[PDB]
From a paper:
[name] is a RING-between-RING-family E3 ubiquitin ligase and a component of the linear ubiquitin chain assembly complex. [name] E3 ubiquitin ligases like [name] catalyse ubiquitination in a two-step mechanism where ubiquitin is first transferred from the E2 active site Cys to the E3 active site Cys before being transferred to the substrate. Here, we show that [name] is unable to ubiquitinate lysine but can efficiently ubiquitinate serine and a variety of model and physiologically relevant di- and monosaccharides in vitro. We identify a critical catalytic histidine residue, His510, in the flexible catalytic site of [name] that enables this O-linked ubiquitination and prohibits ubiquitin discharge onto lysine sidechains.
To investigate the importance of His510 for [name] catalytic activity, we determined the structure of the [name] [name] catalytic domain with the active site C460A mutation in the presence of ubiquitin. The asymmetric unit of our structure contains two copies of the [name] [name] domain, one of which is loaded with ubiquitin. The ubiquitin Ile44 patch interacts with the [name] helix, with the ubiquitin C terminus pointing into the [name] active site. The ubiquitin therefore mimics the donor ubiquitin as observed in the E2-ubiquitin/[name] transthiolation complex. Ubiquitin binding does not globally alter the [name] [name] fold, but we observe two distinct changes. First, ubiquitin binding alters the angle between the [name] domain and its N-terminal helix by 30–40°. Notably, the conformational changes are not restricted to the N-terminal helix, but ubiquitin binding also rearranges the [name] active site. The biggest differences are observed in the protein backbone around the active site Cys460 residue (mutated to Ala in the structure), in the active site loop between Gln455 and Asp461, and in the sidechain orientations of Trp462 and His510. In the ubiquitin-bound structure, Gln455-Lys457 form an extended β-sheet with the ubiquitin C terminus, whereas the same region in the unbound [name] [name] adopts a less structured conformation. The ubiquitin C terminus also leads to a different rotamer of the Trp462 sidechain, where Trp462 is flipped towards the active site Cys460, leading to rearrangement of the His510 sidechain away from the active site.
Author numbering:
A (entry chain C): 1 to 76
B (entry chain A): 424 to 510
C (entry chain B): 431 to 510
Write the structure that this text describes.
Amino acid sequence: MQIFVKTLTGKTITLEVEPSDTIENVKAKIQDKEGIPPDQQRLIFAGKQLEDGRTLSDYNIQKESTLHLVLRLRGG
Amino acid sequence: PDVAARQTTEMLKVMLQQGEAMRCPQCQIVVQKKDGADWIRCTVCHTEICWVTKGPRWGPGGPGDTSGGCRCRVNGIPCHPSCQNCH
Amino acid sequence: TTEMLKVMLQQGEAMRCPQCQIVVQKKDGADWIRCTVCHTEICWVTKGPRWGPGGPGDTSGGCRCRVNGIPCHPSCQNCH
Ligand SMILES: [Cl-]
Ligand SMILES: [Zn+2]
Ligand SMILES: [Zn+2]
Ligand SMILES: [Zn+2]
Ligand SMILES: [Zn+2]
Ligand SMILES: [Zn+2]
Ligand SMILES: [Zn+2]
């Protein structure tokens, strides 16, 4: 299954997942492709933050759906 | 669908309005601050961001360049009355 | 070893040269490698060509590091 993640304004990346993958699993695929540590990643679909323990299915994320990546960073 | 896309657009709009997120002024990814002081460094492009003014800490020369950015403490004037430390 | 290289390639310790497809092994520490066979410049941190077909300086392909001030990868220190 293919999904899309928005990153920079106007840029997206493509991922290869299955309906049963967990969110923590998807953040690990984002790491391997874009180099962003999982704990810095916050994923949004349909207006809600995704919980690390659910899977794409629980959020009804289907083929060609689009997620939005947000960076959660520690203040200095 | 487009409903899911518009629900995310609205969530992001609200985060921006409430000061809970901004776009990195250099690479334009959306960033949130978790705890700490009035500044963050973007993980993608390494730009230093002044969180309290929601803009770049420095000009295009990088750290130390006060020809742009929030110019905190140039001539002794903080960048914002609530700044405690934007680096 | 022939069998060892098979493993490094799947584990990301080696890659195929983006121009000539020969096996290139990781240079520890470095984000850039020059292919010993075809001499093309390789961006190791993104595992791809450093440049487009015009060679060094040609940002019509490659990783485009530092274009618009954006590094090619959050972990890149210097891919030339
Ligand atoms: Cl900076
Ligand atoms: Zn940035
Ligand atoms: Zn400031
Ligand atoms: Zn300040
Ligand atoms: Zn080669
Ligand atoms: Zn590169
Ligand atoms: Zn680079």
